[PDB]
Design an enzyme around this catalytic site. Structure first.
Site, PDB file in Angstrom:
ATOM      1  N   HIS A  41       7.762  29.498 -15.925  1.00  0.00           N
ATOM      2  CA  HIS A  41       7.549  28.092 -15.503  1.00  0.00           C
ATOM      3  C   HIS A  41       8.678  27.183 -16.001  1.00  0.00           C
ATOM      4  O   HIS A  41       8.675  26.032 -15.597  1.00  0.00           O
ATOM      5  CB  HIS A  41       6.153  27.568 -15.868  1.00  0.00           C
ATOM      6  CG  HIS A  41       5.924  27.321 -17.318  1.00  0.00           C
ATOM      7  ND1 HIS A  41       6.561  26.312 -18.011  1.00  0.00           N
ATOM      8  CD2 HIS A  41       5.094  27.922 -18.197  1.00  0.00           C
ATOM      9  CE1 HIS A  41       6.161  26.323 -19.265  1.00  0.00           C
ATOM     10  NE2 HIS A  41       5.255  27.295 -19.402  1.00  0.00           N
TER      11      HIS A  41
ATOM     12  N   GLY B  97       7.111  21.363 -25.863  1.00  0.00           N
ATOM     13  CA  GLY B  97       8.306  22.135 -26.247  1.00  0.00           C
ATOM     14  C   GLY B  97       7.935  23.377 -27.035  1.00  0.00           C
ATOM     15  O   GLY B  97       8.852  24.131 -27.389  1.00  0.00           O
TER      16      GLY B  97
ATOM     17  N   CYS C 108       6.027  25.783 -25.788  1.00  0.00           N
ATOM     18  CA  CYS C 108       6.017  26.877 -24.781  1.00  0.00           C
ATOM     19  C   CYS C 108       7.139  27.872 -25.099  1.00  0.00           C
ATOM     20  O   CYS C 108       8.267  27.426 -25.394  1.00  0.00           O
ATOM     21  CB  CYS C 108       6.164  26.322 -23.372  1.00  0.00           C
ATOM     22  SG  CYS C 108       4.884  25.112 -22.959  1.00  0.00           S
TER      23      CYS C 108
END
Ligand SMILES: Cc1cc(CNCCS(C)(=O)=O)ccc1Br
Ligand SMILES: [Cl-]
Ligand code: NA
Lengths: 301, 300
Positions: free
Chosen positions: A41, A143, A145
């Site tokens: 993503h 952030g 992820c």
């Protein structure tokens, strides 16, 4: 003595964390040999995330659309591919800090350490369990992820988790390092809720052994029980069934303390019905279910 | 979202952990530049436990009585000295993994990460606080002696604790990295007991502010309190007195949430009176006191 929620030493993983940027999106990647692993993503704009066609979005992308940074050093991306929900960026340089590692998929009830990162920069470590409903109760701001979860077995890092998203309830969903989701989740902006969660019975029992080992003995009693009897109580309180395999894994703790699992199950049966009569166990007012038998043996022996 | 006892990444500390052996005693040392720091009690035997004369035991040692091992490499000791309760072995090699560091002495209520280590091998990391009675509620087995506590602020490792001993109540006592003990303790196995422990009130308040930030308001009330009235109540539950310093320290979280420090103090007085009536705050059924005001702003 003493008993704490304890993470593995993070250093072998800190050596693998990089920052990955695609367009305006920045997040964390895992750099092992000459590949950087991150959530697919990262190739999405906020428009894209409502119904992404990852196939299409990625053939439209090229190597140069990816900015990989290891501290203050640009890595050059020389290849890109997708495995499930994970993006693999081939780089020109093998990580000289690559540990001995494998990719492993964990089972619900199993624990692992999470290195929380922001801009490819490690910020915190904490121990988690993979919940029966396949979420984890982590701590993740924007952030985060691409942050990963791992076990260490001697010198070998077993990578088991990469953070993709937070669910509406504050809990977190991610994949194994082959990009397969844990639980019925998709990497799109859409209505997703965690299943009603259950208590990891074998872990609660392991933790009662930890409490006994550390002198907290009050909840023990003269009674014993049976799997069938206990499991009718467990099912009633949204506890996972105890299998014969659970009983055998607690084996060592059952020895070191003289309290047989159905002996300890009778203590637990009574804590579920009657409560803690106010008192605490290892400084908790709740029945802690994020220590495995292995965790208790590891920390206490 | 979510709120967890988070420890600092342990890597910069892992590259400094070595094994120190003297007589039959093996425990952990901290390798920074050309110095290895460990507890001076490494030079004691059974008969030296009650009344060790450390200056007498140390003058009888040569450099080669100390076996320092960094993984497989044996380090050569070329010097030894004692500073308070810490032994400083000089070695011929500067640790190439030495991070940016400093030594700081912390106050009760402050938090840090511990890297528990055995035979100079790191085993695990967890978050602690210095309790008001100058102990820590750690997890430490035999051989963990010389394990360190630290903070990491902006790439600088601030070492604030070295583990020396477990007291009879199962809590832990140690020194700063200048070898001065936290609290009234001594490196003698003579009978010692920690003071009655208390709850770190300023930390509980920060954690309540954290609950409000992550969207929990069930425990707020329409009351306020005077500082003095709050302390007369809080002390009846073994809570530390709250000082004007503590009030100032919470000013940011106050402003962030729009709840005055003394309104939040009224909420805490009520929670002590009522308990949680089967509810939880940030996933706890007890009032958490091992998150500092600074920790709550960092993690949130
Ligand atoms: C004073 C003190 C002495 C010791 C001596 N070591 C323990 C057992 S042995 C014979 O292997 O050294 C430990 C802690 C303190 Br505090
Ligand atoms: Cl401090
Ligand atoms: Na029993």
């Amino acid at each position: 003595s003493g008993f704490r929620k304890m993470a593995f030493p993070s250093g072998k993983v800190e050596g693998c964390m990089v920052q990955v940027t695609c367009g305006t999106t920045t997040l964390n990647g895992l750099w092992l040999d000459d590949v950087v692993y991150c959530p697919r993503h990262v190739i999405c704009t906020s428009e894209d995330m409502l119904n992404p066609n990852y196939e299409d979005l990625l053939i439209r992308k090229s190597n140069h659309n990816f900015l990989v940074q290891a501290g203050n050093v640009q890595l050059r991306v020389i290849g890109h591919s997708m495995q499930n929900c994970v993006l693999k960026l081939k780089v020109d340089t093998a990580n000289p800090k690559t540990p001995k590692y494998k990719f492993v998929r964990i089972q619900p009830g199993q624990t692992f350490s999470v290195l929380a990162c922001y801009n490819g920069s490690p910020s915190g470590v904490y121990q988690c369990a993979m919940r029966p409903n396949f979420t984890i109760k982590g701590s993740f701001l924007n952030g985060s992820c691409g942050s990963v979860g791992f076990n260490i077995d001697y010198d070998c890092v077993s990578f088991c988790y990469m953070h993709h998203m937070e669910l509406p309830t504050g809990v977190h969903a991610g994949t194994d390092l082959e990009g397969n989701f844990y639980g019925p989740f998709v990497d799109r902006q859409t209505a997703q809720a965690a299943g009603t969660d259950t208590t990891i019975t074998v872990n609660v029992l392991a933790w009662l052994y930890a409490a006994v080992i550390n002198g907290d003995r009050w909840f023990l009693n003269r009674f014993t029980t049976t799997l069938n009897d206990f499991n009718l109580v467990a099912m009633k309180y949204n506890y996972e069934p105890l299998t014969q395999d659970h009983v055998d894994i607690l084996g060592p703790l059952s020895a070191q303390t003289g309290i047989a699992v159905l002996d300890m199950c009778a203590s637990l049966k009574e804590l579920l019905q009657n409560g803690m009569n106010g008192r605490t166990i290892l400084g908790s007012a709740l029945l802690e279910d994020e220590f495995t038998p292995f965790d208790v043996v590891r920390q206490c022996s």
